[PDB]
């Protein structure tokens, strides 16, 4: 019971970042990630 559906392009999750004079965010943890960049020569 599946078919092809058409819909408006979504630009991703909409998130409103809080902003204030005395508000600040510092990371308490980190992650070491490895990516891949492929270029022709």
């Amino acid at each position: 019971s599946q078919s092809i559906i058409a819909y408006t392009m979504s630009l991703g999750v909409e998130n409103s970042v809080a902003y204030s004079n005395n508000s600040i965010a510092i990371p308490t943890n980190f992650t070491i990630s490895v990516t891949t960049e492929i270029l022709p020569v």
């Binding site: 630009l11 991703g12 999750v13 909409e14 998130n15 409103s16 970042v17 809080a18 902003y19 004079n21």
Partner: protein
């Protein structure tokens, strides 16, 4: 795609604006317009 959209997360402007004395309303979009554009983008579209 390589220029306009860098990230996949949409960010919004807070309703209460205190920037420390700076006015960004020129570069920020105006929701009252039928098409979404800023005060600078309004001139960029009319001159082309």
């Amino acid at each position: 795609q390589e220029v306009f959209a860098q990230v996949k997360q949409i960010y919004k402007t807070p309703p209460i604006k205190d920037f420390g004395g700076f006015n960004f309303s020129q570069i920020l979009p105006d929701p009252s317009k039928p098409s979404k554009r800023s005060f600078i983008e309004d001139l960029l579209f009319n001159k082309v």
